[PDB]
Amino acid sequence: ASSTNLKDILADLIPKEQARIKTFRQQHGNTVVGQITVDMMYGGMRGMKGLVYETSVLDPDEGIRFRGYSIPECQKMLPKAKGGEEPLPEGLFWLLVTGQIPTEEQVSWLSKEWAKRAALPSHVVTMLDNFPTNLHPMSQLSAAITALNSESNFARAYAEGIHRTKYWELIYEDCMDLIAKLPCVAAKIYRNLYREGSSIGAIDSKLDWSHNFTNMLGYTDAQFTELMRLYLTIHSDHEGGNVSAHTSHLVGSALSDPYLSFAAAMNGLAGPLHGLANQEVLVWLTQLQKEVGKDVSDEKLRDYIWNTLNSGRVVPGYGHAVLRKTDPRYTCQREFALKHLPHDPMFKLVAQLYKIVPNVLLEQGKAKNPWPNVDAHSGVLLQYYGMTEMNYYTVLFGVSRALGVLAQLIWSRALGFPLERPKSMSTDGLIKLVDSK
Amino acid sequence: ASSTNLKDILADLIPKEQARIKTFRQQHGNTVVGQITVDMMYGGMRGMKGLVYETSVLDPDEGIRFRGYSIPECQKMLPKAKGGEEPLPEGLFWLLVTGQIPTEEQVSWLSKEWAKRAALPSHVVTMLDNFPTNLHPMSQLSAAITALNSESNFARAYAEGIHRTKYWELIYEDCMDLIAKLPCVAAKIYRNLYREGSSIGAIDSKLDWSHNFTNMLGYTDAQFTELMRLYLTIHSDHEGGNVSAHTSHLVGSALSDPYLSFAAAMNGLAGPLHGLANQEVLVWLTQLQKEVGKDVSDEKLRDYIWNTLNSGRVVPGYGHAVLRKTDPRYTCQREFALKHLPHDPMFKLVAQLYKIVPNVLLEQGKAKNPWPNVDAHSGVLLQYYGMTEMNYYTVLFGVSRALGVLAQLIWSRALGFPLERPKSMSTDGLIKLVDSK
Numbered sequence: 083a084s085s086t087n088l089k090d091i092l093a094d095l096i097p098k099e100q101a102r103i104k105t106f107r108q109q110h111g112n113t114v115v116g117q118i119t120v121d122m123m124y125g126g127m128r129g130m131k132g133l134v135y136e137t138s139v140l141d142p143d144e145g146i147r148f149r150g151y152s153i154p155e156c157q158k159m160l161p162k163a164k165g166g167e168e169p170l171p172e173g174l175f176w177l178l179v180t181g182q183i184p185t186e187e188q189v190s191w192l193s194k195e196w197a198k199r200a201a202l203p204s205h206v207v208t209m210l211d212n213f214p215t216n217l218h219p220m221s222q223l224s225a226a227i228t229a230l231n232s233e234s235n236f237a238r239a240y241a242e243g244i245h246r247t248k249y250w251e252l253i254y255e256d257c258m259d260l261i262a263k264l265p266c267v268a269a270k271i272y273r274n275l276y277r278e279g280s281s282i283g284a285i286d287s288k289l290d291w292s293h294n295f296t297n298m299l300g301y302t303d304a305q306f307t308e309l310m311r312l313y314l315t316i317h318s319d320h321e322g323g324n325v326s327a328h329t330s331h332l333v334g335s336a337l338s339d340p341y342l343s344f345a346a347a348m349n350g351l352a353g354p355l356h357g358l359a360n361q362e363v364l365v366w367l368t369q370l371q372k373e374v375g376k377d378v379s380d381e382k383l384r385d386y387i388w389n390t391l392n393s394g395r396v397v398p399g400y401g402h403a404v405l406r407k408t409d410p411r412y413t414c415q416r417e418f419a420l421k422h423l424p425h426d427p428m429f430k431l432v433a434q435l436y437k438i439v440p441n442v443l444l445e446q447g448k449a450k451n452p453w454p455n456v457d458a459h460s461g462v463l464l465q466y467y468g469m470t471e472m473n474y475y476t477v478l479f480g481v482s483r484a485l486g487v488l489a490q491l492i493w494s495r496a497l498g499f500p501l502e503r504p505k506s507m508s509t510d511g512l513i514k515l516v517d518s519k
Numbered sequence: 520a521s522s523t524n525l526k527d528i529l530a531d532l533i534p535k536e537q538a539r540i541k542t543f544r545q546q547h548g549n550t551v552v553g554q555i556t557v558d559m560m561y562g563g564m565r566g567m568k569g570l571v572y573e574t575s576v577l578d579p580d581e582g583i584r585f586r587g588y589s590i591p592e593c594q595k596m597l598p599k600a601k602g603g604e605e606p607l608p609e610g611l612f613w614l615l616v617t618g619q620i621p622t623e624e625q626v627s628w629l630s631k632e633w634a635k636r637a638a639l640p641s642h643v644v645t646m647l648d649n650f651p652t653n654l655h656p657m658s659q660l661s662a663a664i665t666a667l668n669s670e671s672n673f674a675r676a677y678a679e680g681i682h683r684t685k686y687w688e689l690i691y692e693d694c695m696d697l698i699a700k701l702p703c704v705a706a707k708i709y710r711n712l713y714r715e716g717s718s719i720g721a722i723d724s725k726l727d728w729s730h731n732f733t734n735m736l737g738y739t740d741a742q743f744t745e746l747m748r749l750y751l752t753i754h755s756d757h758e759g760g761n762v763s764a765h766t767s768h769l770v771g772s773a774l775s776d777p778y779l780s781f782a783a784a785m786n787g788l789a790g791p792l793h794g795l796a797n798q799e800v801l802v803w804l805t806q807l808q809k810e811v812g813k814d815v816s817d818e819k820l821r822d823y824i825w826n827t828l829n830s831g832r833v834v835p836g837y838g839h840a841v842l843r844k845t846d847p848r849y850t851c852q853r854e855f856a857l858k859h860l861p862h863d864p865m866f867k868l869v870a871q872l873y874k875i876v877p878n879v880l881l882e883q884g885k886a887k888n889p890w891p892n893v894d895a896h897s898g899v900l901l902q903y904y905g906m907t908e909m910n911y912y913t914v915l916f917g918v919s920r921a922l923g924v925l926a927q928l929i930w931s932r933a934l935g936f937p938l939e940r941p942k943s944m945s946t947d948g949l950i951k952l953v954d955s956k
C-alpha cells in the first residue's frame with residue numbers, strides 16, 4: 083500500500099549513511115588527505131581540499147556528475163516533460179537528494195508539491211512592488227529571500243527547542259517551500275522591472291516547475307520552455323567549493339535557516355566574479371557589437387580581445403577555477419543550439435569565439451584552463467528567445483542553483499556536520515611561522 | 520600644511536605591504552603550514568588553517584589582539600570620548616586599518632566623516648517602514664542592507680571598467696559610507712519595532728558615532744553611552760575564522776561590493792550558533808527566571824543546567840571554537856560591571872554561573888573549553904541600561920561587527936587576494952581517497 087513522498091524516502095536513507103561515514107571516520111579520521119601551504123593560504127584555497135559535500139562532484143578533466151550522473155547521463159536518464167526531450171528539474175532534485183533516478187510519477191509528485199507550496203507572503207510582494215527600478219534584480223532578489231525567513235518552519239522550531247536529531251526534517255519543509263516560492267519572486271522581479279505593470283498570474287498545478295515560471299514571466303514559446311528546463315538542470319549543483327554553494331554551506335552551518343542561508347549565497351552569486359559574468363559576456367558582446375563594430379575580422383576581434391586584457395580586465399566565459407577541460411555545460415548548450423537556432427548572428431560568433439578567445443590566453447597562459455565555460459553560450463540563447471535584459475540573467479542562475487544548494491543543506495543537518503570555523507592566520511605571524519620558526 | 524584622512528595613509532601603507540608579502544611568498548610559497556586530515560574535513564575546518572587575515576588574531580590562551588593590542592592595551596592607548604573613560608571605536612577602526620593607534624584629532628576626523636556620510640536613501644526608509652512586526656530586527660536588518668548597495672560606488676565602477684589596482688579604493692569609499700549609515704538603520708529597526716512611533720531624528724556631527732546612536736535609540740542615560748562605546752569595541756573583530764568574518768571575506772572575494780558582502784555575513788551572524796546566543800543566555804534567563812524559579816540554589820540551578828543538556832540542547836555563553844581560555848571580552852565587561860552595577864540580581868548571578876556551568880561540562884568535557892564567552896556577559900548589562908528586547912541584541916553585535924568586516928575587506932581588495940575556491944570532497948570519493956588509494 084501507500085504512495086509518493088521524498089521525506090519517507092530520506093528517513094530510510096539518512097541513518098544508513100550516518101552509520102556509514104561513522105565507520106569510515108572511526109577508521110580514517112586518522113588520515114592526512116592533503117597538504118596546507120603558504121601559497122594556498124594566500125591564494126584562496128586553490129587545491130586546498132576543505133569540504134565534504136555530496137550533492138555533486140566536479141572532475142577537472144571530466145567534470146560534473148550528479149550521482150556520478152554525468153549531465154549526458156542525466157540528460158537521457160532523468161525524466162522528460164510530457165511532449166519534450168529535456169531533463170525536467172524535479173527529476174534532478176530527485177537525483178541529487180537520493181542518488182536515485184526517478185519515476186515520472188515521482189517527479190510529478192514533486193512538481194505539484196512545489197506548486198502546491200508555492201504561495202507568496204503579503205509583505206514580500208509589498209516590498210517587491212516597492213523596489214526602485216534602479217536596483218539590481220539580484221539585490222532585490224536577496225532582499226525578498228532574506229525577508230522570506232518569516233515563513234521559516236525550522237527557525238520557528240528552534241526557538242521552541244526542537245531536539246538535535248530532527249533538524250534535517252524542518253529544513254526539509256523550509257527548503258521545499260523556498261524552491262517552491264523562488265520562481266514567482268524571480269518572475270516577479272522581472273515583470274516589475276522589465277514589463278512593468280503586468281501580473282505574474284496563477285500557478286497551474288498541472289504544470290511543472292520550470293513551466294510555471296515560463297508562464298509567470300509571460301513568455302509563450304514552447305521551445306523556450308525546453309531551454310529553460312535545460313538551464314534549470316545544468317546550473318544547479320557544481321560541487322561545493324564555489325562561492326555561492328560554499329557560502330550557503332557555511333551560513334548554513336551556524337544553524338541559520340535555508341531562506342537566510344540561500345540569500346547569503348546570492349551575494350556570493352552576485353559577485354561579478356561569481357555570477358555576473360553571464361550577463362557580462364553579452365555586456366562585452368554589445369561592447370564588441372559597438373565598439374569594434376558590426377562585422378569584423380578575428381584580427382580587430384583579437385585586438386579587441388587583447389583590447390580588454392591589457393586594460394587589466396576580466397575575460398568572462400573562458401577558463402575556470404578548477405575545470406581544466408571543456409565544461410560539459412558548454413557542450414550541453416551547443417547541441418541545443420545546433421538543434422533550434424543554427425542560423426543566429428551571435429550564435430555562430432559563438433562558434434567563432436569558439437576558436438579565438440583562449441588562444442589569447444594561450445598567448446597569455448593567464449590561468450590554467452583554455453577551454454569553454456557555461457557563461458559563454460547561455461546568453462546567446464537567451465536573446466534568441468527574447469530574453470534580452472542581461473541584468474536579469476543571474477536571477478535565472480539562482481533559480482536553477484536553488485536546487486543544489488538546499489540539496490546539501492538537507493544533508494548536512496541530517497549528517498550533523500558542525501560549524502564552519504577555520505583557522506585564519508596573520509601575515510606578520512605567518513612570517514613568524516614558516517621562516518622564523 | 521594639510522589635514523586628516525585615512526586614505527592618504529593608505530596609499531603609502533598599501534604598496535609597502537604588497538612588496539612585503541611579495542618577497543615573503545617568493546620565499547615561502549613553498550612552505551607547508553600543516554595538515555589536512557579527514558576528521559577536519561568532516562568536522563568543520565577545526566585547526567584547519569585556511570586563511571591569512573589581517574585585522575585581528577586570536578590566541579587560545581591569550582585571545583584577541585588588534586595589532587598586537589590586547590583589549591586592555593586598547594582600553595587605555597585608544598582615545599576616549601570627551602568626558603568618559605571608554606575606548607571610542609572610531610579609534611578602534613583606526614588601530615586595525617593603519618596598524619597604528621590614533622590621535623584624538625584623527626579620531627575627531629573619523630567621527631566627523633562618518634557623521635557626514637550617514638545619509639539614508641529614500642527606498643531604505645520606505646521598506647524599513649514596511650517591515651512587519653514578526654520579522655527579527657536582523658532579517659529586517661540585512662534586507663535593508665542588501666538593498667542599500669544601490670548606493671554602492673564600487674558596484675558602479677566595476678560596471679564601467681575601473682582598473683584592478685584601484686580596487687581597495689572604491690571599497691574604501693563604500694565601507695566608510697557603510698559603517699557610517701548602518702547604525703541609522705540599526706536604530707531605525709528598534710524604533711519601528713519596540714518604540715513603535717517615534718523618529719530617530721538628529722545626527723549631530725560634533726558628536727561621536729556611538730553617541731549619536733544612543734541618541735537615535737531614544738536612550739538618555741550617559742552611562743549607557745560608555746558601555747556602548749566599549750561594547751562596540753569588543754564586538755569588532757575576532758579573526759577571520761568565524762562565520763561572519765569569513766563569510767564577508769568570502770562574498771568579498773567575489774568582487775561583490777561591501778554592502779552585499781556585509782549583509783550575507785549578518786545572516787551568518789544571525790545563526791543561533793553564531794550571534795543569536797547573546798539573546799539566548801537571556802533566553803534561558805527568563806527560563807531560569809520562571810522554570811526553576813526566582814531564588815534557587817546551585818542544585819536545582821545545576822539541575823537546571825543539566826536538564827537542557829540531556830535534552831541535547833545548546834548552552835550559550837560557555838565555551839568556544841578556538842579559545843581554550845576566559846575571554847578578554849568577558850573580563851573586559853566584568854571590570855565595567857564592578858564599577859557601575861555590583862548591586863544586581865542578574866549581575867551577581869552573572870557570577871553565579873561563574874563557578875557552576877562548565878563544571879557540569881567538566882562533568883561532560885562537551886567541548887574543550889571550560890572558561891566564559893562574550894555572549895555570557897553583555898546581555899545582563901543591557902537590561903541594566905534598560906535595553907530589554909533580547910531579540911535586538913544581535914543587531915547590537917553587527918553594528919560593532921561592521922568595523923572588523925569592513926576593516927579586513929579593504930585590505931583584501933588592496934592586497935588583491937583572489938577568490939576563495941576550496942576543494943570539496945564527497946564521501947564516496949573520500950572513501951576511494953584515503954584507503955582505496
Ligand SMILES: O=C([O-])CC(=O)C(=O)O
Nearest residue numbers: 320323324325403404940
Ligand atoms: O566551481 C566554480 O568555481 C563555480 C561554478 O562553475 C559554479 O558554481 O557553478
Ligand SMILES: O=C([O-])CC(=O)C(=O)O
Nearest residue numbers: 503756757760761762840
Ligand atoms: O570566533 C568565533 O567562533 C565566534 C566569535 O567569538 C566571534 O565571531 O566573535
